[PDB]
């Protein structure tokens, strides 16, 4: 039925998993610049198409589909590692991201993780460019066999934090995913997570058609409370949001 409306809304969670591109950093211009360059000597490669269909995909997987002659892990690592310096020094934080990452750093490190389709050499530089501490639990492109939209990166994250899915009682193992992209939202949902959609890459109208449970403009809508050692939980607070599903608070 109709969305929730009351603010703030408070949710006890066991862990939080964060996407990087579009969620922590607006790296999309840098990534688009890379794809245009990649395509410049490939007549069969429609960079425009690839840029807009591959949000949240591993670069290796986009290349495997659209230019498979170049689907070589070391080569892709080399290409991606160059992106931050060449095209991404002007990349900005999703508003509130720096603050939220700092607030997460104050919690036990086992309460959160990053799971990105970016390679490690690219993603680590994004944190440096925003002056955010590199995350301790940090899942990247080559840490998984299957990338988003398959759940593997998010399964690996929740399992690594000590909260595998509890199918019988999902309220005993409560994990939220923060994501901007359809691929990531599908992956998060398939990993049994509650989903916070960030309306950066896409707008509210678009994300209302996707499996996110709550949609926010950015992270200025979001705070974290105090760790509770007894329940191994932390309080997630939404000071504001654009849309929240009627069952958001239920697992
Ligand atoms: Ca993303
Ligand atoms: Cl929603
Ligand atoms: Hg796009
Ligand atoms: Hg953050
Ligand atoms: Hg999950
Ligand atoms: Hg949604």
Swiss-Prot record:
It is an enzyme of class 3 (hydrolase). Induction: In response to both anaerobic and osmotic stress. Expression seems to be under the control of YIG1. There is a cross-link at residue 65 (Glycyl lysine isopeptide (Lys-Gly) (interchain with G-Cter in SUMO)). Pfam families: Hydrolase (PF00702). The gene is GPP1. The modification Phosphoserine is found at residue 91. Mg(2+) binds at residues 19, 21, 180. There is a cross-link at residues 65, 145 (Glycyl lysine isopeptide (Lys-Gly) (interchain with G-Cter in ubiquitin)). The keyword Magnesium applies. Major isoform of glycerol-1-phosphate phosphohydrolase involved in glycerol biosynthesis. Plays a role in osmoadaptation and required for adaptation to anaerobic conditions. Present with 193000 molecules/cell in log phase SD medium. This is Glycerol-1-phosphate phosphohydrolase 1. CDD domains: HAD_ScGPP-like. GO terms for biological process: glycerol biosynthetic process; response to osmotic stress. It comes from Saccharomyces cerevisiae (strain ATCC 204508 / S288c) (Baker's yeast).
């Amino acid at each position: 039925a109709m969305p929730l409306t009351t603010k703030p809304l408070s949710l006890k969670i066991n862990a939080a998993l964060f996407d990087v591109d579009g969620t922590i950093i607006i790296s999309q211009p840098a990534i688009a610049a890379f794809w245009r360059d990649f395509g410049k000597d490939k007549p069969y490669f429609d960079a425009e198409h690839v840029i807009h269909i591959s949000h949240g995909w591993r670069t290796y997987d986009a290349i495997a589909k659209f230019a498979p002659d170049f689907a070589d892990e070391e080569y892709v690592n080399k290409l991606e590692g160059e992106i931050p310096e060449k095209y991404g020094e002007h990349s900005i934080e999703v508003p509130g991201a720096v603050k939220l990452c700092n607030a997460l750093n104050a919690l036990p490190k086992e309460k959160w993780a990053v799971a990105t389709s970016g390679t490690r050499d690219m993603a680590k530089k994004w944190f440096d460019i925003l002056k955010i501490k590199r995350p301790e639990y940090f899942i990247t492109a080559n840490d998984v066999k299957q990338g988003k939209p398959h759940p593997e990166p998010y399964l690996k994250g929740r399992n690594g934090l000590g909260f595998p899915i509890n199918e019988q009682d999902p309220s005993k193992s409560k994990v939220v995913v923060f994501e901007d992209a359809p691929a990531g939202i599908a992956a998060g949902k398939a990993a049994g997570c509650k989903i916070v959609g960030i309306a950066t890459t896409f707008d509210l109208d678009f994300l209302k058609e996707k499996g996110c449970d709550i949609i926010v403009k950015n992270h200025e809508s979001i705070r974290v409370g105090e760790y509770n050692a007894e329940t191994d939980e932390v309080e997630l607070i939404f000071d504001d949001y654009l849309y929240a599903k009627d069952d958001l608070l239920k697992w």
